[PDB]
Ligand binder design. Structure first.
Ligand SMILES: [Mg+2]
Ligand SMILES: [Mg+2]
Ligand SMILES: [Mg+2]
Ligand SMILES: [Mg+2]
Ligand SMILES: [Mg+2]
Ligand SMILES: [Mg+2]
Ligand SMILES: [Mg+2]
Ligand SMILES: [Mg+2]
Ligand SMILES: [Mg+2]
Ligand SMILES: [Zn+2]
Lengths: 95, 203, 93, 144, 39, 56
RNA sequence: ACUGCUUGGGAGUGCAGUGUCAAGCUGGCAGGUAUGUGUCUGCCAAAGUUAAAUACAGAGUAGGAAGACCGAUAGCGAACAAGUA
């Protein structure tokens, strides 16, 4: 970690303590992929088929109605990031 | 990892297979009493998350609850006093529907002690939460370290006191920190603590 | 009151510091936008069961109002604006 | 002490200083600050002129700890320096050193005529303090 | 609880540098850091 | 099934929540474990000496 | 999202209803002004128990210590067969 110079203001503003980079514990493993949790979810998608939303989005995604998809999903998910990932992953299931 | 399959199968409630299973049930559940005991949970994996264990003295109940907002029970729909306090149809109950189902059940059957409830199904008119009541005086319960807290008198009607997970949800206790400071031991406790007129003995 | 469609009024801009003919446009108040700081309050305050929660002014007495004139020198965008006397029929030409 | 109230003086004088006419009522005007914009308008405008209105930008969830920057002037650095230690402080010699966080001060405003040098040690300084402090032969050393 | 302390010392190179323009560069450096990127 | 040590599997036809096993045929199909649905959890029951078996 | 209550919480503090309804292969939530985006920081919700320090603001049980308090029109309604006649 960048040493923080003894000055009060600036790009490293602190008391000149010797900072310790660290992090590992267990919660950082949430950032990691759950390859097995996807194997499961993939097994459920090919079981259950698609959602009425998820089908309704692919019908739009057939047509060049790309923007009416994520703009349909955000209404159905709230998140716009979530709306993109869903349209994103759907873009593959359609591919 | 059978739970992992059965847990994500239920994360697809909108899938047409799960939408069909749920359809038949809500049909099937409409033609049943508001409370219905089950020898087994509809959702074994979900009941078990909430502390249900297939043991003696654990029993499951599917408690129905009408959906939609509260109509405030003023006579002829009239309301008196200030115009703010008027409004019959649109004011909503400040209580959860898992809470109301945990409370219907725990009041019908004071024999027991509800542990948790989970959503089971919901047609247009009703929601079904299957409660996991423990029977305090089953010996299996009394003698199991993981569960015998429920036996202690402090939890007699946890649900009526809003202690169950549902009753902590509407009670705001799903938030620590700055989003629940006015709420935090309790809304009442927060109120005392702020509205007390403290008189330090020497001021 | 007829008003000239253009005027050599004095200009505060550094580019100017001089009299310049100004393209006169009448000031019409802008649209009352939804996410004005105080519309959001009024909307939040109109949610619920109190009826009207703030007064609505009803009885006007003014028949006329001051005619603000937005101006702008040919030189630049900046819009100096200045008031006139009340009139029942301002109309530049 | 109840003995001393003029309640006790005017025991016998029927209206307790409230007047025979114009009787002592209750709330002859409203509770508290009622009519601050009406019948007490002359009052707030005379005495509490800025009382009504809004003036500036909001600062939602203000945290004053981050904002904490208490100040000590050059003219007051004798409060911190030991009088014994401060005894001989030629600018070209050794100087008392004065950490200001220890003493509870953050910035160093450069007010009056400092003349006894010190190596002030503080988080902030005025344009005029570091200048004065140098011209006295002392030196601020920045800390945090 | 252990902590730092200081004695006392002759002023050295400190007499030359103005710590303010040092303090104020470093403050301004952060304060207008986002506005000096766009320029 | 997942470890694919199973070399045949016998899902029961009927189950209180079919959800318990509803996924299972897709899971054997994925691990390419042979599987069969069979008429009653009661027969997988007695076959295993249990009064019901969701699977074998 | 809408509605409604609620909050100091302010383009939403918490909640509820209804609709909608995720993610976990640049995860999620918080980071007190909305949005899209990029960094960084803390966290890891939707299951559970848990003493002590705290309340007793018209309770009780069993005791105790008091008072710059009242002193029989006072102090509790009740110093008495008083929540009695
Ligand atoms: Mg007199
Ligand atoms: Mg008087
Ligand atoms: Mg009189
Ligand atoms: Mg008077
Ligand atoms: Mg009079
Ligand atoms: Mg203010
Ligand atoms: Mg209120
Ligand atoms: Mg979790
Ligand atoms: Mg008496
Ligand atoms: Zn100009």
């Amino acid at each position: 970690p960048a040493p923080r110079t003894g000055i009060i203001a600036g790009f490293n503003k602190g008391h000149k303590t010797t900072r310790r980079a660290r992090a590992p514990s267990s919660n950082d493993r949430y950032a990691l992929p759950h390859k097995k949790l996807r194997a499961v979810k993939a097994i459920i998608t090919d079981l259950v088929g698609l959602s009425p939303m998820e089908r309704r989005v692919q019908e739009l995604l057939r047509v060049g109605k790309d923007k009416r998809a994520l703009k349909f999903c955000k209404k159905r998910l709230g998140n716009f990031k979530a709306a993109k990932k869903r349209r994103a992953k759907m873009e593959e299931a359609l591919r | 990892g059978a739970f992992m399959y059965l847990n994500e199968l239920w994360k697809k409630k909108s899938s047409d297979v799960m939408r069909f299973i749920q359809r038949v049930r809500a049909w099937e559940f409409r033609h049943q009493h508001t409370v219905v005991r089950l020898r087994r949970p509809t959702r074994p994996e979900k009941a078990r998350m909430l502390g249900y264990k297939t043991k003696q003295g654990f029993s499951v109940f599917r408690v129905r609850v009408r959906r939609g907002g509260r109509k405030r029970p003023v006579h002829k729909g009239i309301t008196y006093g200030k115009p703010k306090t008027s409004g019959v149809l649109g004011v909503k109950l400040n209580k959860n529907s898992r809470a109301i189902a945990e409370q219907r059940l725990g009041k019908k059957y004071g024999n027991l002690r509800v542990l948790n409830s989970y959503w089971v199904n919901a047609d247009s008119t009703f929601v079904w939460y299957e409660v996991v009541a423990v029977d305090p005086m089953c010996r299996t319960i009394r003698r199991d370290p993981r569960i015998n807290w429920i036996v202690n008198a402090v939890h007699k009607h946890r649900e009526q006191r809003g202690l169950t997970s549902a009753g902590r949800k509407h009670r705001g206790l799903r938030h620590k920190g700055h989003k629940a400071s006015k709420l935090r031991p309790s809304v009442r406790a927060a109120w005392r603590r702020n509205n007390r007129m403290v008189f330090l003995r020497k001021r | 009151v007829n008003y000239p469609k253009k005027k050599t009024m004095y200009c505060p801009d550094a580019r100017c510091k001089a009299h310049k003919s100004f393209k006169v446009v009448q000031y019409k108040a802008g649209k009352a936008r939804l996410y004005a700081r105080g519309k959001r309050r009024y909307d939040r305050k109109q949610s619920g069961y109190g009826g009207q929660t703030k007064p609505i002014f009803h009885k006007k007495a003014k028949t006329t109002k001051k005619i603000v004139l937005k101006l702008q020198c040919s030189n630049c965008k900046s819009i100096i604006q200045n008031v006139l006397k009340r009139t029942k029929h301002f109309e530049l030409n | 002490p109840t003995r001393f109230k003029k309640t006790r003086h005017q025991r016998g004088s029927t209206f307790c200083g409230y007047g025979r006419v114009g009787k002592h009522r209750k709330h002859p005007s409203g509770r508290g600050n009622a009519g601050g914009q009406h019948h007490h308008r002359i009052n707030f405008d005379k005495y509490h002129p800025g009382y009504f209105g809004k003036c500036g930008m909001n600062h939602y969830h203000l945290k004053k700890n981050p904002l904490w920057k208490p100040t000590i002037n050059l003219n007051n650095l004798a409060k911190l320096i030991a009088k014994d230690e401060a005894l001989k402080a030629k600018k070209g010699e050794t100087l008392p050193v004065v950490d200001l966080l220890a003493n509870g001060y953050s910035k160093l405003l450069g007010n009056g005529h400092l003349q006894t040098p010190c190596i002030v040690k503080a988080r902030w300084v005025s344009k005029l303090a570091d200048k004065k402090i140098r011209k006295a032969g002392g030196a601020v050393v920045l800390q945090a | 609880t252990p902590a730092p302390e200081a004695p006392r010392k002759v002023t050295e190179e400190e007499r030359t540098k103005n710590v303010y323009k040092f303090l104020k560069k470093n403050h301004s450096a952060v304060r207008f850091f986002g506005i000096r990127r766009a320029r | 099934i997942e470890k694919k040590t199973a070399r045949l599997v016998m899902i029961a036809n009927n189950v209180d929540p079919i959800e318990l096993v509803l996924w299972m045929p897709t899971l054997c199909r994925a691990n390419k474990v042979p599987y069969a649905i069979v008429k009653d959890k009661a027969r997988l029951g007695d076959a295993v000496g249990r009064k019901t078996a969701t699977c074998v």
